Protein backbone atom coordinates (compact mmCIF):
# COMPACT_ATOMS: atom_id res chain seq x y z
CA UNK A 1 0.00 0.00 0.00
CA UNK A 2 2.16 2.83 -1.29
CA UNK A 3 1.29 6.52 -1.26
CA UNK A 4 0.26 7.62 -4.75
CA UNK A 5 -0.23 11.33 -4.12
CA UNK A 6 0.86 13.68 -6.90
CA UNK A 7 3.86 15.08 -5.00
CA UNK A 8 5.04 11.58 -4.11
CA UNK A 9 4.64 10.26 -7.65
CA UNK A 10 6.60 13.22 -9.01
CA UNK A 11 9.55 12.44 -6.72
CA UNK A 12 9.13 8.78 -7.60
CA UNK A 13 9.40 9.22 -11.39
CA UNK A 14 11.83 12.15 -11.66
CA UNK A 15 15.40 11.55 -12.82
CA UNK A 16 16.30 7.87 -13.05
CA UNK A 17 12.85 7.02 -11.71
CA UNK A 18 11.91 3.57 -10.45
CA UNK A 19 14.17 0.60 -11.19
CA UNK A 20 13.04 -3.03 -11.38
CA UNK A 21 15.03 -6.24 -11.78
CA UNK A 22 13.80 -8.50 -14.59
CA UNK A 23 14.49 -10.55 -17.71
CA UNK A 24 13.63 -9.70 -21.30
CA UNK A 25 11.22 -12.26 -22.72
CA UNK A 26 11.40 -10.76 -26.20
CA UNK A 27 10.11 -8.15 -28.62
CA UNK A 28 7.43 -8.97 -31.20
CA UNK A 29 6.06 -6.92 -34.08
CA UNK A 30 2.28 -6.48 -33.77
CA UNK A 31 -0.39 -5.12 -36.12
CA UNK A 32 -2.14 -2.67 -33.79
CA UNK A 33 -1.44 -0.17 -31.00
CA UNK A 34 -3.63 -1.92 -28.44
CA UNK A 35 -5.80 -4.89 -27.55
CA UNK A 36 -5.96 -7.46 -24.77
CA UNK A 37 -6.06 -10.38 -27.21
CA UNK A 38 -3.35 -8.83 -29.39
CA UNK A 39 -0.95 -8.71 -26.44
CA UNK A 40 -1.81 -12.10 -24.99
CA UNK A 41 -1.26 -13.77 -28.37
CA UNK A 42 2.07 -11.96 -28.72
CA UNK A 43 3.14 -12.92 -25.18
CA UNK A 44 2.30 -16.56 -25.85
CA UNK A 45 4.37 -16.49 -29.05
CA UNK A 46 7.41 -14.86 -27.44
CA UNK A 47 7.26 -17.31 -24.54
CA UNK A 48 6.97 -20.15 -27.03
CA UNK A 49 10.27 -18.99 -28.51
CA UNK A 50 11.84 -18.69 -25.06
CA UNK A 51 10.76 -22.24 -24.19
CA UNK A 52 12.27 -23.52 -27.42
CA UNK A 53 15.59 -21.83 -26.67
CA UNK A 54 15.57 -23.02 -23.07
CA UNK A 55 15.24 -26.61 -24.28
CA UNK A 56 18.53 -25.89 -26.02
CA UNK A 57 20.03 -24.49 -22.83
CA UNK A 58 19.47 -20.80 -23.57
CA UNK A 59 18.39 -18.22 -21.00
CA UNK A 60 16.52 -14.92 -21.10
CA UNK A 61 18.69 -11.81 -20.92
CA UNK A 62 19.00 -10.39 -17.40
CA UNK A 63 17.97 -6.72 -17.35
CA UNK A 64 16.71 -3.94 -15.15
CA UNK A 65 14.07 -1.57 -16.41
CA UNK A 66 13.28 1.91 -15.23
CA UNK A 67 10.03 3.82 -15.25
CA UNK A 68 10.54 7.58 -15.30
CA UNK A 69 9.35 10.74 -17.03
CA UNK A 70 11.62 9.47 -19.78
CA UNK A 71 9.32 6.50 -20.24
CA UNK A 72 10.54 2.91 -20.06
CA UNK A 73 14.25 2.15 -20.37
CA UNK A 74 15.76 -1.33 -20.49
CA UNK A 75 19.34 -1.77 -19.32
CA UNK A 76 21.56 -4.85 -19.61
CA UNK A 77 22.18 -6.03 -16.03
CA UNK A 78 25.74 -7.27 -16.48
CA UNK A 79 27.04 -4.03 -18.03
CA UNK A 80 24.45 -1.44 -17.02
CA UNK A 81 24.23 -0.25 -20.64
CA UNK A 82 21.00 1.19 -22.01
CA UNK A 83 19.62 -1.13 -24.68
CA UNK A 84 16.06 0.02 -25.28
CA UNK A 85 14.36 3.33 -24.64
CA UNK A 86 10.67 3.89 -25.28
CA UNK A 87 9.44 7.39 -24.49
CA UNK A 88 6.10 7.96 -22.80
CA UNK A 89 4.57 9.22 -26.06
CA UNK A 90 5.59 6.02 -27.90
CA UNK A 91 3.95 3.63 -25.43
CA UNK A 92 0.35 2.96 -26.39
CA UNK A 93 -0.87 0.08 -24.23
CA UNK A 94 0.14 -1.86 -21.11
CA UNK A 95 -0.90 -5.47 -20.63
CA UNK A 96 -0.45 -7.94 -17.81
CA UNK A 97 0.06 -11.60 -18.62
CA UNK A 98 -3.12 -13.26 -17.31
CA UNK A 99 -1.23 -16.55 -17.16
CA UNK A 100 1.79 -15.20 -15.28
CA UNK A 101 1.77 -12.91 -12.24
CA UNK A 102 5.47 -12.25 -12.92
CA UNK A 103 5.22 -11.05 -16.52
CA UNK A 104 3.74 -8.12 -18.45
CA UNK A 105 4.33 -6.34 -21.72
CA UNK A 106 3.68 -3.08 -23.53
CA UNK A 107 3.05 -1.96 -27.09
CA UNK A 108 5.25 0.83 -28.41
CA UNK A 109 5.88 2.65 -31.68
CA UNK A 110 3.89 4.84 -34.08
CA UNK A 111 1.31 3.63 -36.61
CA UNK A 112 2.70 0.85 -38.79
CA UNK A 113 5.59 0.20 -36.40
CA UNK A 114 3.94 -1.33 -33.32
CA UNK A 115 6.01 -3.72 -31.22
CA UNK A 116 5.09 -5.69 -28.11
CA UNK A 117 7.87 -5.79 -25.52
CA UNK A 118 7.51 -8.71 -23.07
CA UNK A 119 9.06 -8.61 -19.60
CA UNK A 120 9.52 -11.30 -16.90
CA UNK A 121 9.82 -9.44 -13.58
CA UNK A 122 11.95 -10.79 -10.72
CA UNK A 123 9.17 -10.03 -8.24
CA UNK A 124 5.45 -9.59 -9.01
CA UNK A 125 4.61 -7.60 -12.16
CA UNK A 126 1.73 -5.71 -10.55
CA UNK A 127 3.82 -2.92 -8.94
CA UNK A 128 5.48 -2.24 -12.29
CA UNK A 129 2.18 -2.11 -14.17
CA UNK A 130 0.78 0.19 -11.48
CA UNK A 131 3.81 2.49 -11.71
CA UNK A 132 3.18 2.78 -15.45
CA UNK A 133 -0.50 3.55 -14.81
CA UNK A 134 0.40 6.23 -12.25
CA UNK A 135 3.14 7.67 -14.47
CA UNK A 136 0.87 8.06 -17.50
CA UNK A 137 -2.02 9.53 -15.49
CA UNK A 138 0.35 11.95 -13.76
CA UNK A 139 1.81 13.16 -17.05
CA UNK A 140 -1.70 13.56 -18.50
CA UNK A 141 -2.76 15.55 -15.44
CA UNK A 142 0.33 17.76 -15.41
CA UNK A 143 0.09 18.43 -19.14
CA UNK A 144 -3.58 19.34 -18.76
CA UNK A 145 -2.60 21.87 -16.08
CA UNK A 146 0.43 22.78 -18.22
CA UNK A 147 2.91 22.01 -15.44
CA UNK A 148 4.78 19.00 -16.84
CA UNK A 149 7.97 21.01 -17.40
CA UNK A 150 7.74 22.46 -13.88
CA UNK A 151 7.74 18.93 -12.44
CA UNK A 152 9.97 16.87 -14.74
Amino acid sequence: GQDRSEATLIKRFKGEGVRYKAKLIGIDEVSAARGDKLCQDSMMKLKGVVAGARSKGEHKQKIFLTISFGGIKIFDEKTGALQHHHAVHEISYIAKDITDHRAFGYVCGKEGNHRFVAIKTAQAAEPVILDLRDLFQLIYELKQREELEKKA
Binding site: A33, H89, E90, S92, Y93, Q137, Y140
Partner: peptide, 10 residues
Protein backbone atom coordinates in the same frame (compact mmCIF):
# COMPACT_ATOMS: atom_id res chain seq x y z
CA UNK B 1 -4.54 -3.64 -19.08
CA UNK B 2 -4.83 0.00 -20.04
CA UNK B 3 -4.26 2.56 -22.77
CA UNK B 4 -1.68 5.29 -22.30
CA UNK B 5 -3.59 8.60 -22.17
CA UNK B 6 -0.53 10.48 -23.44
CA UNK B 7 0.31 8.25 -26.41
CA UNK B 8 0.80 9.98 -29.78
CA UNK B 9 -0.21 7.79 -32.73
CA UNK B 10 1.44 10.29 -35.11
Amino acid sequence: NFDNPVYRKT
